[PDB]
Design a protein around this ligand. Sequence first.
Ligand SMILES: [Cl-]
Ligand SMILES: [Cl-]
Ligand SMILES: [Mg+2]
Ligand SMILES: [Mg+2]
Ligand SMILES: [Mg+2]
Ligand SMILES: [Mg+2]
Ligand SMILES: [Mg+2]
Ligand SMILES: [Mg+2]
Lengths: 296, 302
Amino acid sequence: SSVRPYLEECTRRFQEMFDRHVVTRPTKVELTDAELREVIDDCNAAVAPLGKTVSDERWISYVGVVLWSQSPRHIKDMEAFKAVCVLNCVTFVWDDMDPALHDFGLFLPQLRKICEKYYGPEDAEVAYEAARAFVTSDHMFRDSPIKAALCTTSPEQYFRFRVTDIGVDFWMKMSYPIYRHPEFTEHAKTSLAARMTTRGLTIVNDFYSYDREVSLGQITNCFRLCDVSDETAFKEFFQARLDDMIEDIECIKAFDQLTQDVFLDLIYGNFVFTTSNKRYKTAVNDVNSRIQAAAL
Amino acid sequence: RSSVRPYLEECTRRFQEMFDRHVVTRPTKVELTDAELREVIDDCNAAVAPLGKTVSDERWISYVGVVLWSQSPRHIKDMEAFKAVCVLNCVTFVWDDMDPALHDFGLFLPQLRKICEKYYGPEDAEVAYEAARAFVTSDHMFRDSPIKAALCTTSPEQYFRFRVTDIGVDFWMKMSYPIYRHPEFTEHAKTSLAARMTTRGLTIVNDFYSYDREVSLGQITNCFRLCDVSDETAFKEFFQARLDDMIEDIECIKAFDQLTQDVFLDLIYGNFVFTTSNKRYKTAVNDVNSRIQAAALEHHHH
Ligand SMILES: [Cl-]
Ligand SMILES: [Cl-]
Ligand SMILES: [Mg+2]
Ligand SMILES: [Mg+2]
Ligand SMILES: [Mg+2]
Ligand SMILES: [Mg+2]
Ligand SMILES: [Mg+2]
Ligand SMILES: [Mg+2]
């Protein structure tokens, strides 16, 4: 199936939800041309050992999510920002890669290289460990019975899987050096930061990446828990997910002012990234195609 | 002065029937040698000594029972790592029981590091230390925090999300994986998926048996504060939803690899046996579970 029928009303329902509960719109980070090419050179170098080329356009697509979903008001360290740019893009290639291409012995050293270039010694270890856990999870769970069980049982089992699998725990553990805000750093390191933002990021991503994933046999998507064919059941389910996002956003506002800005800019920036970026406008295209092995 | 006392017998039997149906395999208590117990307690005294409060041998042994009951003795390979978890868990229980006036990070974090460096190799010691640091920093950070009030009063979902860290199960997995040297378990511990899978089963059990103590101390971190426990109908409907939660988690746990699921279920079932047998949960206020308090005249000359 597909959710294109619902695409227009749901975008509006999302946007109305954000306009009431978040209000402040996200704003896109503009990189200088130098900065952008540093990022892209760093990206190509990290995936090169894996034997696949990535166009400058596919990198700019990936990087949009970081340009839209950080918190410019509070940025203090732009070297850390660039690291998140590079780390997020290259793990995007991994997510799209056939597992045959997953070579840990070749790719884990490049991840460490990136982390040691942009972070101090401590932050580099934190970012690296989170990058390593993320690519290792994506690998381990292709065709895992665990993934099956967690994705088909209930929303509560599914979002639990997604704390790691969608990459938000990774994101927080590499983004906290951007802000050098002590409270935020601690919520990143306990993963409470990821836990608070997982549903807002996943429900949005799931709706707009449903068609791609479903075409590719990918089960990691909460709308597979309902009959998107049944208009009534889809509406009941969509509302419960919106309810989920609203409850999360309202608790987020108990966090200190800077932390809540970063959390809410992330959820909302990701919705803007996802509704505008080319990755999510069609199932298979030049920036979201499966990176295939190609046998012989 | 609310209480779940009237439900104690039926609730305990309902928990037990749930384990008999869904887990089946019983936990087994790890027996420590007299030497091993003494190394642990000596190491606990050393670590807390800089904080100026004495902890009795009886109270240590109370704390240590959860590790003796809730690890997975079928699969223990590293007893040095086992001893570290005994020590780390006991001394962070003390911290959990302490007035925050007593919380000296400068004094206590290096003692946590020393324990980790004693029992673990270098990489493992850093993972255990970081988890330990994160736990005591969370417990301290959230004493009368408005974030805790929001997460704990809003819904079960928000509450259990706070408890992944706050009950200490993430810390437990991240200091326990060296015991087993099992690769899948190690990865699940490092992603926190292991903690996430076991949070509700540990939290619901603990919350029921520590409710009376916690309401009496003003402590709001307990899911049964989300319902009117003096309302039998509302309590039983809430209790049954929490059993459903435990059952759903247990059944997904059984999709994990066999060793990992043995470890996950021994933790949840072992914690239930520890909780329903240990003096700590026998009464709300006693000499193994009383608040460890600072003295307002601790600085005095008499
Ligand atoms: Cl998938
Ligand atoms: Cl509390
Ligand atoms: Mg993925
Ligand atoms: Mg994907
Ligand atoms: Mg997706
Ligand atoms: Mg306590
Ligand atoms: Mg506590
Ligand atoms: Mg308790």
